[PDB]
Amino acid sequence: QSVEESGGRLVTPGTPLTLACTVSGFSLNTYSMFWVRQAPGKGLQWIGIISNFGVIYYATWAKGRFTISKTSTTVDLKITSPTTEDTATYFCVRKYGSEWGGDLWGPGTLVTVSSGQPKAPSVFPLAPCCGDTPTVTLGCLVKGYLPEPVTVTWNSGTLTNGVRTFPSVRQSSGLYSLSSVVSVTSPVTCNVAHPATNTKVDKTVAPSTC
């Protein structure tokens, strides 16, 4: 029924890491699973596959770089010796019966390979200039973080209507930045979680810059 990847994190080149794909609602005794990755802003790339009987095949480029395995609840992907170019979102995918294609995909887990150290985001409130006459859009600027992602919620996730969280952009420093804005009928709090640094910051945004 569903697939969820975990274990994406920031590592230095040469540091082994393993990703887990946890399945629910079906058995790996029955279904084969495969791994696909997607470098930021790039296309899909097939890594390899493990049958319901445990027989594994790898893409030619992937041979010796990855090891696929399975447990009672998961398939796993060990990246033997990560390089900067292994920075990607990794997806696990349930194979449908008739071909080596996939019907059920996970959300993906993001691997970052870099010599830069992790950095918690700094958060700043966004509001109209002091005194603007109003429906109001308020926001939070979330900057200087590594790795992606941050999770931005409003009012502890209870506010989801009228929210726009722009895609992050990576600066030359390797750090990321984004803003999230919410439109409300004329207080809102942004919550900025960064699983990597286990930090969560809350900012209750004044309705103007006064």
Partner: protein, 213 residues
Amino acid sequence: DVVMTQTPASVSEPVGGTVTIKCQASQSISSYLAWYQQKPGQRPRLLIYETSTLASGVPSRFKGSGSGTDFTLTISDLECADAATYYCQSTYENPTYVSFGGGTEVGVKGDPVAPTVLIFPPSADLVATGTVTIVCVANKYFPDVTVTWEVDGTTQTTGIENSKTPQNSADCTYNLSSTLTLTSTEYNSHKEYTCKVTQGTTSVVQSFNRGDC
């Protein structure tokens, strides 16, 4: 190994129009080809497998055809909801044959909509960091905009970074953030800050004065 060559790299068609996407296989893969749709920031979704068989729930407007080394996805009655990158995949049962095409970024052309614009002066504590970031937002617009920043009437050429949301699923519109970054010394040396959002010869501006905010 099999290489899938997908063309075009990108295409835009009007609502109600037709998008034709092709994949060429470097070796015959018989009928073993699938198509996926991937919306920005989301996971890939299976549309078609076995060249032509629709995944459940996937509308008939999506039509897969071809065989051997030549394959086609045709998307009819194009909807704003269809804005996505589409990928073919050889699904042939041999690891030397499996691979994805390079994708086709499909934009959907809906009704023109002029942006509104919001500007966000930097907070006192932001200025206090030594690095000022000014945020501008272009709301609910189509087609693309270009953004410029003016500081006391002078067009800025550095420190500008833009980020665009996916096309709205119902009306095709975009939203964009544009951010201008300067040192607090640079910031404090100027008065009027203007974000200018342009579509052709028509621009919408928002401005503030540093001392007012």
